[PDB]
């Protein structure tokens, strides 16, 4: 009964993206994806969660405890290769599906050297479409820390230097049923930089113990 993409029978990720629209987008629209998961559309490889304890805040909110809460089958790792060739709008959009009408709490902890730099928490509430309930956290604004991190990171003269910094930069993302405090989806993000010719790309793992 193992996961075949990023979700559970109780909450699935439809689509995630982090993006910038340039100011000339009003003239003709364009967006650049830094990172992108689409599951609008085989079992998933696994990673032992102890291997990535150290990259994360290791106290309340942290990947150790949340796994100990369970359920373990809600836990994933996403390796992102971010695409970094591009006063615009810097945005994040998430979209989730469920069969339950729920109210989600959506936390994103940014940890830099495994250490919580910013936490953003939004709650979102269901809408009913084709039987499934749909949760849209669309066009949430990027944390200013990431926007300025991105501008610094892109100017590094060597891609191995970006991957050296990004080896210390992680994001933990926890989706909770607000009414029952009850964990649906935990996603740990680690990052490299992709190349010029390749765009954004990702690989999803199960997290196990
Ligand atoms: C604080 C901003 C926020 O809520 N985000 C949550 C989140 C989760 C995953 C990815 C991103 N965006 C992102 C990730 C990595 C890069 C970089 F290029 F540096 F690798 C840029 C953007 C967010 C933003």
From Swiss-Prot:
Q: Keywords on this record?
A: Activator, DNA-binding, Nucleus, Transcription, Transcription regulation
- From the Swiss-Prot or TrEMBL record, give the protein name: Transcriptional enhancer factor TEF-4
What species does this protein belong to?
Answer: Homo sapiens (Human)
| GO MF | disordered domain specific binding; DNA-binding transcription factor activity; DNA-binding transcription factor activity, RNA polymerase II-specific; RNA polymerase II cis-regulatory region sequence-specific DNA binding; sequence-specific double-stranded DNA binding; transcription coactivator binding
Q: What does this protein do?
A: Transcription factor which plays a key role in the Hippo signaling pathway, a pathway involved in organ size control and tumor suppression by restricting proliferation and promoting apoptosis. The core of this pathway is composed of a kinase cascade wherein MST1/MST2, in complex with its regulatory protein SAV1, phosphorylates and activates LATS1/2 in complex with its regulatory protein MOB1, which in turn phosphorylates and inactivates YAP1 oncoprotein and WWTR1/TAZ.
The protein's location, in the record's own words, is:
Nucleus
Describe, as the record does, how this protein assembles with itself and its partners. Interacts with YAP1 and WWTR1/TAZ.
What are the GO cellular component annotations? chromatin; cytosol; intracellular membrane-bounded organelle; nucleoplasm; nucleus; TEAD-YAP complex; transcription regulator complex
**Predominant cellular place of this UniProt entry's protein:** nucleus
**Annotated stretches, region: Transcriptional activation:** 1-209
What stretch of the whole protein does this chain cover?
218 to 446 of 447
Provide the GO biological process annotations: cellular response to retinoic acid; embryonic heart tube morphogenesis; embryonic organ development; hippo signaling; lateral mesoderm development; neural tube closure; notochord development; paraxial mesoderm development
Q: Source taxonomy lineage? A: Eukaryota, Metazoa, Chordata, Craniata, Vertebrata
């Amino acid at each position: 009964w193992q996961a075949r993409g990023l979700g559970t029978a109780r909450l699935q990720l439809v689509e995630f993206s982090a993006f910038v629209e340039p100011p000339d987008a009003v003239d003709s629209y364009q967006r650049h994806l830094f990172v992108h998961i689409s599951q609008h559309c085989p079992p998933l490889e696994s990673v032992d969660v102890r291997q990535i304890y150290d990259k994360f805040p290791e106290k309340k909110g942290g990947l150790r405890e949340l796994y100990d809460r369970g359920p373990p089958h809600a836990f994933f790792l996403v390796k992102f290769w971010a695409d970094l060739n591009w006063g615009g709008f810097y945005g994040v959009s998430s979209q989730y599906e469920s069969l339950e009408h729920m109210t989600l709490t959506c936390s994103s902890k940014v940890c830099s050297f495994g250490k919580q730099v910013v936490e953003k928490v939004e709650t979102e509430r269901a809408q009913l479409e084709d039987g499934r309930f749909v949760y849209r956290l669309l066009r949430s604004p990027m944390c200013e820390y990431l926007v300025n991190f991105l501008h610094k990171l892109r100017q590094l003269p060597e891609r191995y230097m970006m991957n050296s910094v990004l080896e210390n930069f992680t994001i933990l993302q926890v989706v909770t049923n607000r009414d029952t405090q009850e964990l649906l989806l935990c996603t740990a993000y680690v990052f490299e930089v992709s190349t010029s010719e390749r765009g954004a790309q990702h690989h999803i793992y199960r997290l196990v113990r």
